[PDB]
RNA sequence: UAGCUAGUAGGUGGGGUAACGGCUCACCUAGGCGACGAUCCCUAGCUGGUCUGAGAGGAUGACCAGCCACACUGGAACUGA
RNA sequence: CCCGCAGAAGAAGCACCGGCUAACUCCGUGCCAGCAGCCGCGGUAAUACGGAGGGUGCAAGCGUUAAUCGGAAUUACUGGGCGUAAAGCGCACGCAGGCGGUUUGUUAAGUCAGAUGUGAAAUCCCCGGGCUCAACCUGGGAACUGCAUCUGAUACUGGCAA
């Protein structure tokens, strides 16, 4: 704080590391989804949350949430993980992109349709 | 030509014998549009009684400000409790660009185009109190020249 | 004229050469405080007249060894 | 890239006549103005501070028919120019070619003037300008070409030019169907009710 | 120990204005009489008087306009820990010109107006607001 | 060899050539010793289209600089005045 | 990461280069660097600039332009301005 | 680029609507299905979930994700703190370092003023010009806050002498 003390040793704010080690800080990665689960949340909430566990293409084995009502994932099903924490499940840090490699769009959906991988219904 | 406006209403509580009792606090600022700024606090059991006590206290307890053409004169810093507040005259630096609860007091104060930036705490009850203190100890070139001879 | 510097002898013991500390007094780029700052230079002198603790002026010349691109002009202020 | 919808709906959310259907008749009479901008339009909004700033910007864009990236660029240009940024912003919106064609009475609305400008019916200084946002300099002559002169629209539009207030910074003359943008409009020469400090403060947050 | 007698002088004047003191004495020097002459010239003090022979004592008769005090805020800028030397373009105005800043220029101890008019910057001693 | 030559700087299908003095083995739009005028082959039919500092050109040709065919054509165009 | 350095630091003489120079060799001296951070370790092409910022700064250095380095990997020279 | 032809004829999505944050009701579900940036919604009349109607914001785009700066005065040089919130070494002595009462003389290193050389061009900024306008291209200037040298000033700081 004294200016001599800063000449001797300057200020230094820490690095504030990343929530998502999707390495290189890439927007999506792809993985193999080693298994598929349902997992109970933390205390104020209760549900069964549909969550896969994925061997990414960079080596990391990370678990990942599966959005929307109902999926078609089973154990090999190469998916595209996205980045984004589900706070209610302890330790999922990622999401799966619905409407991507082996992850179909959400069936019978009409609103917020782009974020669930669903094409525009012809009418 | 009174130009009143309310900044913040809150629900405070008391915790008596049988449960809690909920009261409402207003915080308003009135001002004519040419100096003459006041604020009033006022608290009551319902919201319209609270705002009415706040306006009624704010119409009295009103302070003169030595404005420039449409704005401040020199950059001024006002502090109150934990809330430190800067202002800069911004000689036609268009539009009142102040924080919340400072935009209102500067709006009804009659100033039009200053630059602000509140620091510290930014509780609305103390960020005015730090704008009036501020606009109160801002003096004009005919007051400084009155003090120091010329 | 020539550009020269002034400094003091920091050590002596080498075979027709000397080493001179220069004190430049430079403002800190962030903090705005004028701070002393040295520059040690290996300086040549024929017949090694200046001892330790002196003050000597110094000019730049061709290379005479590794580093050593500096040679004295005038020894002042030798007082022990 | 332009609005293409119900116009009087936009004029009804703002609560104010935005001159979006000037056309044949008088004051609206079939708008249900003020009453219902949608299904819950009978509700008073109790609008916020962001809501009043936003709603002022939307009033101005929906008047002059400008979208947001273009408006935002006008704010950057009005900011960098010397003077008063609100007044500079209205001076940039008033020098638009479709606006100057509307002010001269060549189009009934600003969309009709924008279609006259768009369909190569308008010259400035003897050169045809196809562009809605051409920035008309002072002491310019903007006129209608020989094609699309003596078409019905413009005649009718000049018929309803006399019902309005005849802007001071123009030479409106409808005999030859040519006009002269003489000077930049003063802030006190236009509309009196738009609050441009609200849109300065909207973009300055 | 005393290492900044100028800031000591300005401290004497802040605490004399704050205590409704009529006059302020201190040990005197050439720089304090230079600054005090600038303050009398610009109207922040009423008068000064240097007495003594072998131990000079500067005395500043202070000003009070109304009940309020005239010297609203006097600050020391170029302290010994960190000295501040401005050019003629970097030379600041205090309270947007309503309040002088005493700069020590090579021509002498002047104000900001007087040294910006003289065309030369220097070492900015104190803000008087 | 130093060459007084043109260097293409405008947009696509709209060249603006700046006549510079470069060491001839540099790139075209690369390193130059000094620029000495310009040449716009369009510009409009207004006033100039080309201005070109003849004193510095005469300096460099005095030094030993060569001149490309366009720069020679431009000096043959702007002869002393026209 | 607190000690590092024996062609190492300097001198004399011989050689070498287009050119000064431990550049190289013989001999002599015992230096030199280092807490104003040497040495070691991790990372990294550098700059004009770019992005953000009221500013001071913070991040970055894709295109465009200046400089350096590399040309499968390790080394070497030949020709030649 | 200009002119002629036929006909509105070939040409509108995406996110959001509990608060922050502009924009609301009905129906389905009933701690489920699911949502979520934070606060948190959902255990039967859910403006927060899914659909519909309606609206809001942007628009040939619109959202999400990753990354940077901002907000963050939450590393504070400008511009923070330390009795009790995190923070005064258990207390001293003291080297290197930082700072240093007062007067006169000299120097002029810091400091200040001017000049010169340089700080490539582009980029940013200003005043203009050309592409129908704009983006874009471009003319002239300003700027590049720097460094070096020379000429001065001597109030403050430093050196030297008393």
From Swiss-Prot, chain A:
Coiled coil: none
GO cellular component: a single term: cytosolic small ribosomal subunit
Keywords: Acetylation, Antibiotic resistance, Methylation, Ribonucleoprotein, Ribosomal protein, RNA-binding, rRNA-binding, tRNA-binding
Alphabetized GO MF terms: misfolded RNA binding; rRNA binding; structural constituent of ribosome; tRNA binding
Phenotype upon changing residue 56 to H: Protein is not incorporated into ribosomes
Effect of residue 42 to R: Confers streptomycin resistance but not hyperaccurate translation
3-methylthioaspartic acid PTM positions: 88
Short name of one Pfam family: Ribosom_S12_S23
Modification N6-acetyllysine, positions: 107
Annotated InterPro entries: NA-bd_OB-fold, Ribosomal_uS12, Ribosomal_uS12_bac
Function: With S4 and S5 plays an important role in translational accuracy. Interacts with and stabilizes bases of the 16S rRNA that are involved in tRNA selection in the A site and with the mRNA backbone. Located at the interface of the 30S and 50S subunits, it traverses the body of the 30S subunit contacting proteins on the other side and probably holding the rRNA structure together. The combined cluster of proteins S8, S12 and S17 appears to hold together the shoulder and platform of the 30S subunit.
Protein family (similarity comment): Belongs to the universal ribosomal protein uS12 family.
General remark: At least 19 substitutions or deletions in 11 codons can promote streptomycin resistance, dependence or pseudodependence; all but one of the streptomycin resistant mutations (K42R) are associated with hyperaccurate translation and thus reduced translational efficiency.
Curated annotation (Swiss-Prot), chain B:
GO molecular function: rRNA binding; structural constituent of ribosome
UniProt cross-references to PROSITE patterns, sorted A to Z: RIBOSOMAL_S5 (PS00585), S5_DSRBD (PS50881)
SUPFAM superfamilies hit by this protein: dsRNA-binding domain-like, Ribosomal protein S5 domain 2-like
Pfam short name (any one): Ribosomal_S5
Family named by the database record: Belongs to the universal ribosomal protein uS5 family.
Note from the entry: Altered uS5 proteins have been identified in a number of mutants. Some mutations in uS5 have been shown to increase translational error frequencies.
Binding partners and assembly: Part of the 30S ribosomal subunit. Contacts proteins uS4 and uS8. With proteins uS4 and uS5 encircles the mRNA as it enters the ribosome, which may play a role in mRNA helicase processivity. Can be cross-linked to mRNA. In collided ribosomes contacts ribosome rescue factor SmrB.
Recorded domain comment: The N-terminal domain interacts with the head of the 30S subunit; the C-terminal domain interacts with the body and contacts protein uS4. The interaction surface between uS4 and uS5 is involved in control of translational fidelity.
Listed name of the protein: Small ribosomal subunit protein uS5
Gene name, Swiss-Prot/TrEMBL: rpsE
Swiss-Prot record, chain E:
GO BP annotations listed: cytoplasmic translation; regulation of mRNA stability; regulation of translation; ribosomal small subunit assembly
GO molecular function terms noted in the UniProt entry: rRNA binding; structural constituent of ribosome
InterPro entries the record matches: Ribosomal_uS8, Ribosomal_uS8_CS, Ribosomal_uS8_sf
Listed GO CC annotations: cytoplasm; cytosol; cytosolic small ribosomal subunit
Taxonomy, superkingdom: Bacteria
Pfam families in UniProt: Ribosomal_S8
Keywords: Repressor, Ribonucleoprotein, Ribosomal protein, RNA-binding, rRNA-binding, Translation regulation
Family per similarity comment: Belongs to the universal ribosomal protein uS8 family.
PANTHER family associated with the record: 40S RIBOSOMAL PROTEIN S15A (PTHR11758)
Protein's job: One of the primary rRNA binding proteins, it binds directly to 16S rRNA central domain where it helps coordinate assembly of the platform of the 30S subunit.
Subunit record text: Part of the 30S ribosomal subunit. Contacts proteins S5 and S12.
HAMAP family named in the record: Ribosomal_uS8_B (MF_01302_B)
Name of the molecule in the record: Small ribosomal subunit protein uS8
Native organism: Escherichia coli (strain K12)
From Swiss-Prot, chain F:
Molecular function in Gene Ontology: DNA endonuclease activity; four-way junction DNA binding; structural constituent of ribosome
GO BP: any one term: ribosomal small subunit assembly
Keyword Ribosomal protein appears in the UniProt entry: yes
InterPro entries: Ribosomal_bS16, Ribosomal_bS16_CS, Ribosomal_bS16_dom_sf
One Gene Ontology CC term in the entry: small ribosomal subunit
Listed name of the protein: Small ribosomal subunit protein bS16
Species: Escherichia coli (strain K12)
SUPFAM superfamilies to which the protein is assigned, alphabetical: Ribosomal protein S16 (SSF54565)
NCBIfam families for this protein: S16
Keyword Ribonucleoprotein: yes
Biological function: In addition to being a ribosomal protein, S16 also has a cation-dependent endonuclease activity. In-frame fusions with the ribosome maturation factor rimM suppress mutations in the latter (probably due to increased rimM expression) and are found in translationally active 70S ribosomes.
Family indicated by similarity: Belongs to the bacterial ribosomal protein bS16 family.
Subunit structure: Part of the 30S ribosomal subunit.
Induction of expression: Part of the rpsP-rimM-trmD-rplS operon.
PANTHER family: 30S RIBOSOMAL PROTEIN S16, SMALL RIBOSOMAL SUBUNIT PROTEIN BS16M
């Amino acid at each position: 704080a004294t200016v001599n003390q800063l000449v001797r040793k300057p200020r230094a704010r820490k690095v504030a590391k990343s929530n998502v080690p999707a390495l290189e800080a890439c927007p999506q990665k792809r993985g193999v989804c080693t298994r598929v689960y349902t997992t109970t949340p933390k205390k104020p909430n209760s549900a069964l949350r549909k969550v896969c566990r994925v061997r990414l293409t960079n080596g990391f084995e990370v678990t990942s949430y599966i959005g929307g009502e109902g999926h078609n994932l089973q154990e090999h099903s190469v998916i595209l993980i996205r980045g984004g924490r589900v706070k209610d499940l302890p330790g999922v840090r990622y999401h799966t992109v619905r409407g991507a490699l082996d992850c179909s769009g959400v069936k019978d959906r009409k609103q917020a349709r782009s974020k669930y991988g669903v094409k525009r219904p012809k009418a | 030509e009174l130009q009143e406006k309310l900044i913040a209403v809150n629900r405070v509580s008391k915790t008596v014998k049988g449960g809690r009792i909920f009261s409402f606090t207003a915080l308003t600022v009135v001002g004519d549009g040419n100096g003459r700024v006041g604020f009033g606090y006022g608290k009551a059991r319902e919201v319209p009684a609270a705002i009415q006590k706040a306006m009624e206290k704010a119409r009295r307890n009103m302070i003169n400000v030595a404005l420039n053409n449409g704005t401040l004169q020199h950059p001024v810093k006002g502090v109150h409790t934990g809330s430190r507040v800067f202002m800069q005259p911004a000689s036609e630096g268009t539009g009142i660009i102040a924080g919340g609860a400072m935009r209102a007091v500067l709006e009804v104060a009659g100033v039009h185009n200053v630059l602000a930036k509140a620091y510290g705490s930014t509780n609305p009850i103390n960020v005015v109190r730090a704008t009036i203190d501020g606009l109160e100890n801002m003096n004009s070139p005919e007051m400084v020249a009155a003090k120091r001879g010329k | 004229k020539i550009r020269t510097l002034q400094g003091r002898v920091v050590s002596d013991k080498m075979e027709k050469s000397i080493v001179v500390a220069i004190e430049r007094f430079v403002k800190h780029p962030i903090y705005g405080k004028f701070i002393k700052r040295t520059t040690k230079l290996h300086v040549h002198d024929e017949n090694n007249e200046c001892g330790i603790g002196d003050v000597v002026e110094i000019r730049e010349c061709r290379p005479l060894s590794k580093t050593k691109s500096w040679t004295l002009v005038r020894v002042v202020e030798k007082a022990v | 890239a332009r609005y293409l919808g119900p116009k009087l709906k936009l004029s009804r959310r703002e609560g104010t006549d935005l001159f979006l259907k000037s056309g044949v008749r008088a004051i609206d009479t079939k708008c249900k103005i003020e009453q219902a901008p949608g299904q819950h339009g009978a509700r008073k909004p109790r609008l916020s501070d962001y809501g009043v700033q936003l709603r002022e910007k939307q009033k101005v864009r929906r008047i002059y028919g400008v979208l947001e990236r273009q408006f935002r660029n006008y704010y950057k240009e009005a900011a960098r120019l010397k003077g008063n940024t609100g007044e500079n912003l209205l001076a940039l919106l008033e020098g638009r070619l479709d606006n100057v064609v509307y002010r001269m009475g060549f189009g009934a609305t600003r969309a009709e003037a924008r279609q006259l400008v768009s369909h190569k019916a308008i010259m400035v200084n003897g050169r045809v300008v196809n562009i809605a946002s051409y920035q008309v300099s002072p002491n310019d002559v903007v006129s209608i070409r020989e094609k699309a002169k003596k078409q019905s629209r413009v005649k009718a539009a000049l018929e309803l030019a006399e019902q309005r207030e005849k802007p001071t910074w123009l030479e409106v003359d409808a005999g030859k169907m040519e006009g002269t943008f003489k000077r930049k409009p003063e802030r006190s020469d236009l509309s009196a009710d738009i609050n441009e400090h609200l849109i300065v403060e909207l973009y300055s947050k | 120990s005393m290492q900044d007698p100028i800031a000591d002088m300005l401290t004497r004047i802040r605490n004399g204005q704050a205590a409704n003191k009529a006059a302020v004495t201190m040990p005197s020097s050439k720089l304090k009489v230079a600054i005090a002459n600038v303050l009398k010239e610009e109207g922040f003090i009423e008068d000064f008087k240097v007495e003594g022979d072998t131990k000079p004592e500067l005395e500043l008769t202070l000003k009070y306009f109304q009940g309020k005090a005239v010297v609203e805020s006097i600050q020391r800028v170029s302290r010994p820990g960190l000295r501040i030397y401005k050019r003629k373009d970097e030379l600041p105005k205090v309270m947007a010109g309503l309040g002088i800043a005493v700069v020590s220029t090579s021509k002498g101890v002047m104000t900001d107006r007087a040294a910006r008019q003289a065309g030369l910057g220097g070492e900015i001693i104190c803000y008087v607001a | 060899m130093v060459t007084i030559r043109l260097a293409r700087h405008g947009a696509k299908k709209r060249p603006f050539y700046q006549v510079v003095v470069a060491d001839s083995r540099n790139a075209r739009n690369g390193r130059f010793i000094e620029r000495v005028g310009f040449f716009n082959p369009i510009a409009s039919e207004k006033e100039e289209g080309t201005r070109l500092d003849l004193d510095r050109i005469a300096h460099w040709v005095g030094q030993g600089a060569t001149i490309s065919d366009r720069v020679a054509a431009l000096i043959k165009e702007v002869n002393k005045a026209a």
